[PDB]
């Protein structure tokens, strides 16, 4: 009958929804209630187990974006409960995702505002330097050692193909593959890719990499140009 | 000096023809990689030279 | 039964498993344990086994011979007729098996190996004996 | 206005009758089975390459063999027939190559490139490539996925109001729909890797320094047959770049 | 604790002094302080009796039953005591207008990241049409499979 008296199995489901989203980077969804927001907060504060991130979490109300120290043993309990609290086939879930949520953090309050916010705040401060390189400086770097580096195979690389022929199995699976909308379920495949694209780095980060990006979709009409001559 | 080289290409009896084009870019910059490599090495081999002579 | 023969020798596919059974059995004395095959068997019935029915396998084998002043259990040595461990032992103590020095095992380890993925590690657990 | 108008009369015009009609709907049902047997068509491709790839001995689910590290021979063979079916579904003509290629794992993020998981040396004597394990896994990383979404649309009445009146190994989806990220993958670095195979490393500064321009020289250059880019929005906010 | 209730308090009574006197909105706030708030209700038990409503109307539009007078007055005891100021007496109704704007500002939107767009026409007639002769050959198809 106290006030603690909630729906925890809602406010755990949000939670867990709401760092899916902003940490995972998952998928499409309308996550869109700052009301909810202290749900989770509470919820966390509801134990002192998660509460202990949240010593971390705080550091935001102070605002600037300083790197936070670590601890190396508490930050590893932390990691640790991270996971564990979110229930999570330990996905190597690192200090890099947790940092990126903190930025998160300490780009949310950052707002008094309370209008519609378009704002995608792609970008991060913490990448552990000064401020961002160009990439063509890594351009030279990586290639450099990777050119120093062997190869971890051979190919015998004659002439070889495979392929198969059982085309009622071929059927079969194809009946099996029917229901899906795919059309529908590969989107969400392409966002994966995107985001991977930038997640790539957290290490001065390309900033491009929004037109030419842009421009890849634009290679379907350019298809279509050279259909059409 | 782009020098987009240009060429072109016939049947005899000039039934008809075939156009390309072309870039010295890659062949100057290979022409460099040879020349700089080339002294590398014949610098470096008076060096040897020398020091098994002394 | 038939997969585990086949995965050894199989001179006699028609060879009564009872062949097998009590071949086992020459040895348990000697190693004072219980086969996993037996354990298999009395895990794979419906019911008197660990009991997909009702996944029981609380129903572990207390398991005594002639003179024994113990007995094998399902999960090691036993004094005779008591409830297959004392809450109260000399307890697995946190100090050992600490989640921490777990980890930093596994990491070594994992580290030696150069191995990504597929490790896990538990401690060992005691029961009345140790 | 299309409002196709039909006359017929009797001979000694003795009676003459009146209709008319309009192509719309009629274009509708064509636009509808246009787009019904196409995608068709790229679901069997898509079946067929998967069902080509069931041969390799999947003594593990996909996301296994990636998950591990040990191996580097599972990975090249699939990475080699991924690269064989792409140039195949481009050139109907089953081939082999210059006969000696190889790989490398990169395994550090301090060997990690931005953009692009894979990357060609092409002639370091011999064409050599170097791919991504690590940010392979990344991509594996799938807890990402959920189906139940809504589709975007427009002007139903008159666009779409008419779509709305038509209707072991036994693995499920989700795995498959997986798939389809390292085909495109491949496919883009293909593009670059078909590029400068064909022409200068000049042009291969350029196609990595951005993509953009290299619709130029695919002028004339494709095929005459599309690939992999039906639905033809794929965009997001763009003004909003707010410098 | 590591809760500097000190601040907590100052912020709580400085941003619900200038919400309630603006009886709504308070532009130059951070979002965060909304959080504090609700942390300093739950960490004071003089407040929880509020923070009960408050917490019914954290969804839409709830409404609220009656209270009886002892409830009424203490709620009033507390609002002025968390507002110690010689400036106006208080009136039980304007909470429900501070009601009708925390439902619309916890109601807000929040952030976005970026999402694709994807569904339209792909192409129409504004592309190569089928004509008879491909089909000629198509239809051989059935000259080939005789039977």
Do not use: W
């Not at chain 3, 062949?19 to 086992?24: A, I, L, Q, S, T």
């Not at chain 3, 000697?30 to 996944?55: E, T």
């Not at chain 4, 990636?66 to 699939?78: E, G, L, Y």
């Amino acid at each position: 009958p106290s006030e603690e008296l909630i729906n925890m199995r809602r406010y755990r489901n949000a939670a867990r929804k709401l760092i899916h989203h902003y940490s995972l980077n998952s998928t499409s969804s309308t996550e869109y209630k700052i009301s909810d927001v202290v749900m989770t907060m509470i919820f966390l504060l509801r134990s002192e187990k998660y509460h202990s991130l949240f010593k971390l979490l705080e550091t935001t109300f102070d605002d600037y974006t300083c790197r936070p120290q670590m601890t190396q043993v508490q930050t590893d309990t932390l990691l640790d409960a991270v996971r564990s609290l979110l229930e999570m086939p330990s996905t190597t879930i690192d200090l890099t995702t947790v940092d990126i949520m903190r930025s998160s953090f300490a780009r949310c309050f950052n707002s008094p505002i309370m209008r519609y916010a378009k704002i995608v705040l792609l970008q991060n401060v913490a990448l552990q330097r000064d401020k961002r390189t160009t990439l063509e400086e890594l351009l030279i770097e990586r290639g450099e050692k990777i050119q120093m580096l062997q190869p971890q195979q051979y190919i015998n690389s004659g002439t070889e193909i495979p392929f198969c022929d059982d085309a009622e199995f071929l059927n079969r699976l194809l009946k099996h593959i029917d229901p899906y909308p795919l059309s529908r379920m590969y989107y969400n495949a392409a966002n994966t890719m995107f985001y991977t694209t930038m997640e790539n780095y957290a290490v001065s980060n390309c900033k491009f990499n929004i037109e030419d990006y842009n421009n890849i979709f634009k290679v379907m009409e350019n298809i279509r140009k050279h259909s059409n001559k | 000096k782009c020098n987009k080289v240009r060429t072109v290409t016939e049947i005899v009896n000039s039934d008809e023809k075939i156009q390309k084009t072309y870039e010295l870019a890659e062949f100057d910059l290979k022409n460099l990689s040879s020349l700089e490599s080339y002294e590398t090495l014949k610098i470096k081999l008076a060096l040897s030279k020398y020091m098994a002579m002394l | 039964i038939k997969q585990a023969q086949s995965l050894l020798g199989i001179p006699d596919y028609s060879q009564t498993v009872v062949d097998f059974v009590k071949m086992f059995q020459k040895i348990i004395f000697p190693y004072q344990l219980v086969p996993n095959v037996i354990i298999k068997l009395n895990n794979f019935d419906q019911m008197v086994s660990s009991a997909p029915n009702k996944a029981e396998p609380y129903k572990k084998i207390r398991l005594f011979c002639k003179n024994d002043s113990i007995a094998i259990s399902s999960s090691g040595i036993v004094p005779i007729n008591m409830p297959d461990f004392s809450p109260p032992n000399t307890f697995d103590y946190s100090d050992y098996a600490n989640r921490t020095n777990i980890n930093f095992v596994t990491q070594r380890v994992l580290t030696d190996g150069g191995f990504s993925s597929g490790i896990t590690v538990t401690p060992v657990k005691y029961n009345y004996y140790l | 206005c299309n409002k196709v108008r039909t006359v017929t009369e009797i001979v000694n015009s003795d009676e003459k009758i009146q209709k008319t009609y309009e192509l719309a709907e009629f274009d509708l049902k064509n636009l509808s089975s246009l787009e019904s047997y196409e995608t068709l068509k790229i679901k069997l491709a898509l079946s067929k390459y998967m069902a080509m790839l069931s041969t390799l001995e999947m003594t593990q689910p996909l996301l296994e063999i990636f998950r591990n590290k040990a191996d580097t021979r599972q990975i090249a063979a699939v990475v080699f027939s991924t690269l064989a079916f792409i140039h195949n579904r481009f050139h109907p003509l089953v081939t082999n190559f210059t006969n000696k290629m190889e790989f490398v794992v990169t395994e550090t993020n301090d060997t990690s490139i931005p953009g692009e998981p894979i990357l060609f040396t092409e002639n370091e004597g011999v064409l050599l490539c170097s791919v991504d394990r690590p940010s392979i896994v990344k991509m594996l990383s799938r807890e990402f996925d959920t189906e139940a979404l809504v589709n975007f649309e427009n002007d139903n009445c008159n666009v779409r109001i008419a779509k709305t009146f038509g209707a072991d190994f036994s693995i499920t989806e989700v795995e498959a729909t997986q798939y389809l990220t390292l085909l495109l993958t491949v496919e883009h670095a293909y593009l670059h890797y078909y590029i400068f195979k064909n022409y200068g490393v000049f042009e291969y500064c350029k196609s990595l320094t951005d993509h953009s321009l290299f619709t130029n020289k695919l002028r004339s250059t494709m095929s005459t047959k599309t690939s992999n880019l039906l639905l033809s929005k794929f965009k997001f906010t763009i003004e909003d770049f707010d410098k």
